[PDB]
């Protein structure tokens, strides 16, 4: 297991211009087209970020080069956030990719916002930061996922994956 497998099983791959979770234009692996309730809008975007006229569908190349893109931009944006990238040092292997699932789906500045919880995952203690997450929009929102990456945070096993 990997993060790229991990994210793949939370993500899912829809060749096609599709609505999230919350209403907004996505395609591929989890890539955000657009907040904006336009489908012309999430094409415009769609085809400015391949490269061609893409009428709202790509292939799985495609897709899966938007995915290699958006990975790499969360591992970077963690290790440039003064918050998160302490954090992110001082965890293991497992749990840091945990953390960079959180903030591919929520963002820098969203997984930032858990300060209570990232206080309790860099002094190690577990159940109490597993506890704590659980007590947000996102787990109330998307519960299985979030039980998937809480658990991996909390126990540094690949458990909830396999
Ligand atoms: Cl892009
Ligand atoms: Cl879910």
Request: hydrophobic share 40%.
């Given at each position: ?8 099983i939370?993500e ?8 999230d ?7 591929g ?6 907040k ?43 290790l ?11 965890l ?40 704590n ?30």
């Amino acid at each position: 297991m990997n993060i790229f497998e991990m994210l793949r099983i939370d993500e899912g791959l829809r060749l096609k211009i599709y609505k999230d979770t919350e209403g907004y234009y996505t395609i591929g692996i989890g890539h955000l087209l657009t907040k904006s309730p336009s489908l012309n809008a999430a094409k415009s975007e769609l085809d400015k970020a391949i490269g061609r006229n893409t009428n709202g569908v790509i292939t799985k190349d495609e897709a899966e080069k938007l995915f290699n893109q958006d990975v790499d931009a969360a591992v970077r944006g963690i290790l440039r956030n003064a918050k998160l990238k302490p954090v992110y040092d001082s965890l293991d292997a497992v749990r840091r990719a945990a953390l960079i699932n959180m903030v591919f789906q929520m963002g820098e500045t969203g997984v930032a916002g858990f300060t209570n919880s990232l206080r309790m995952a860099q002094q190690k203690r577990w159940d109490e930061m597993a506890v704590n997450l659980a007590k947000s929009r996102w787990y109330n929102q998307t519960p299985n996922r979030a039980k998937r990456v809480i658990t991996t945070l909390r126990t540094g096993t690949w458990d909830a994956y396999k």
